[PDB]
Amino acid sequence: DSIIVAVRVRPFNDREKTRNCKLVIEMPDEETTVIRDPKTNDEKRFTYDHSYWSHDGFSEKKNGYLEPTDPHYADQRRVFEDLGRGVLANAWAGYNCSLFAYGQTGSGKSYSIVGFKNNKGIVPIVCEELFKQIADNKKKNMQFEVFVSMMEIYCEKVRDLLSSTPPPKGGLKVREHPKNGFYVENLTTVPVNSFKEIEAKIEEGTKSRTIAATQMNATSSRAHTIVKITFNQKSSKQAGGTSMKKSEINLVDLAGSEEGDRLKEGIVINQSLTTLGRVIKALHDSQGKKTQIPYRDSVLTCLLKNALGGNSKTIMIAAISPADINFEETLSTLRFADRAKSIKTNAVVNENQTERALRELREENLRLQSQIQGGTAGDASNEEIEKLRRQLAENQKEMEEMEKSWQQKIAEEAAKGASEKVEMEAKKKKMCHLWNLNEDPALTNVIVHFIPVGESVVGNKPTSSGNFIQMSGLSILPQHVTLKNDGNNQIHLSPCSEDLDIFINGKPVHGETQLQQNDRVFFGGNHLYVFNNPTKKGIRTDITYENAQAEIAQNHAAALDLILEEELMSTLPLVQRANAMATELGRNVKFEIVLVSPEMRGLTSGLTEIWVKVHNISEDTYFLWEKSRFMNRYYGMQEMYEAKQDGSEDWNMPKERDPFYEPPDSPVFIASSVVFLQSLAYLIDVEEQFPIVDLSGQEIGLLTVGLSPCSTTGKELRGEYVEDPDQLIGKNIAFKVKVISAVGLPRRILKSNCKYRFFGSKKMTTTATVSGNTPAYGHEETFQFKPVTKEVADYLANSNLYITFWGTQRPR
Ligand SMILES: Nc1ncnc2c1ncn2[C@@H]1O[C@H](COP(=O)(O)OP(=O)(O)O)[C@@H](O)[C@H]1O
Ligand SMILES: [Mg+2]
């Protein structure tokens, strides 16, 4: 009784196609997946229960559904008929099931699980078929109960997506029922009678998820989302008194499966994924002395302990991208699904007599009551005598629900408000409104802010006054912007500060600006919206987060080709969130994207480097991070921001642990120098000054370097006259470079050295470190060449040495 692993390949999206990406994934049969290395053509061949090819051979119908043209395209209905049929059979049989999707952010976890628009995924049609199969097949005298729950797991904190109650500190409690396993205490479980009910419930759950993602940066790529459906079949008038069969389905959308500082990256964010990699590994290595599987090292592996080798039927969807750039991550995915493929689970039917279940629950209630008796009269650990009362209250609620009829349950739950959504969708046709625009496509156009017909103010102030639109969360000020609506005919947006970075259509805004139909407004952090006036023109709702960020990156690059644009599309939003998090967490640090062009490196064609300039205003220190280092320490920043939002006592943390601080004696790339080697091409011995430029491109100093030819012996060659540098070809000539001295270095620098790599040496030459701001490096190194090659001659005659400066600013 083993797991069911299935991999699925999404098609090329609209930005990978213009990027000219080669397909690196092939599926021969409906079982095998072949990943071929782009630069090596080496193939790795994996086998699974299903290899879903959703890349070729489909056609978008007028309804939007992607129907397969050839018999190889895995449409939504095929993935359903293979896995949702299985989860429905498990639910009807009495086995509790668990389907989870692993994969990279963008590979298609959310598409496979939930779906997107008219291509519905596992959850919707599984719910629909469950309710239909209830209403159709099962006769005799039986009752059927369907309960839905929905939780998010973020930084090891469990948050109830179906509860408007403000969340506790540290998230909801996770306790281990001794017979049933790990569970979430005080998790909302509503009874649903029709498919519309569970649809609206999951809808408001995704609404809460969207609010968390946009206001507190609870990013979907860094969080897990679980939908828990309990299906109960109650049978009466049997040989025994009465019985109930029970199934618990867990549909899990996992987080994205995607140095100088250990503790300043993520530890709590990736934890549930990290140990998920461990557990699987630990479960695969078991194949001859016992090992230990670390379920308790994270919340996810706790809540999926039965799914990962216990009492459950487990299904896995590994979504992979068919592109060159992701070849590594894809492979990792394919390897993860390969390791989990060897997982045997022991699922049993959950039938229990109603009277004996009630009696067991009551005896546990009595055990807890006696525990609190021993509390008040004995040890009375005020920490423990609250945990015990929590458990007693949960048992009490369970007993109260057992006695209750399902009709009374649905009546009580319907007694507790849905007209808010009806009238919201209604007044969206009459009132001007900004709708959400989120990096997770499954959360775009979910929340909405309505613009009153007067002059209102957007800000992070909990209302309590007139003419106020409340935006709460990251980057939003108590008085952010001012909106002026003229009878839903002419709306003007004006920022309340000159130091407030807000954008419209990507172009920055400095004064009163009139909004127009389908404008793309950005307030800060994650507050990216699209304006809609329902009275004028023709509205639009098919605007993706990728379009707005694309135009923002276009305008930013024009201020300061598609490879660079698509990379700013990944870096810029993170830099916005980094600045907002820094200024909110008390860290007086400012991040700004500095890009190094090929021309700045002495090249003609080439990739443009992206750096994140880091200014620590306190201590007044400057740094410069590679984009990757910024990504890792941004993971750290996001973790710290969540720690603050939870109200923890350990968010403001020491220097060695917070991701915003960088020690001052840390070296930083400060200056650039382009030394043209033409002097070597003509075998002349000269030493001149070359401009030193900071990363703004501004020339700030002069670097005297020495250029001279010398024989392979080491002596000064022989005095010929080179008129064309090809005369050097075939001769044994060496060239020494003498980084003599520099002037004009920044006054803040106290130690510096130079770095370069001569032609074909694969040994990064780095000079000694010198004190003053006018340092005498005194470096020298000859570069031998057995035949001076036409490539080397062209190098000397037309290219240049790219010397970079690395310095420190404060003491040691
Ligand atoms: N199998 C697929 N078929 C068609 N489109 C897909 C598929 N998988 C993903 N996509 C597209 O890729 C985009 C991002 O996928 P998403 O569901 O966000 O994956 P993840 O949540 O794992 O990042 C979606 O907008 C969707 O339209
Ligand atoms: Mg997702």
Author numbering: 5 to 262, 270 to 298, 303 to 431, 435 to 578, 590 to 841
Could you give the paper's own sentences about this structure?
Kinesins are microtubule-based molecular motors that drive long-range intracellular transport or organize intricate microtubule networks. When not transporting cargoes, processive kinesin motors (kinesin-1 to -3) often adopt an autoinhibited conformation to avoid the futile consumption of ATP and the potential blockage of microtubule tracks. Instead of forming a constitutive dimer, most of kinesin-3 motors primarily exist as a self-folded monomer for autoinhibition, although some kinesin-3 members can adopt an autoinhibited dimeric conformation. In addition to the N-terminal motor domain (MD) and neck domain (containing the neck linker (NL) and neck coil (NC)), kinesin-3 contains a family-specific forkhead-associated (FHA) domain sandwiched by two coiled-coil segments (coiled-coil 1 (CC1) and CC2) and a characteristic membrane-associated guanylate kinase homolog (MAGUK)-binding stalk (MBS) domain in the middle.
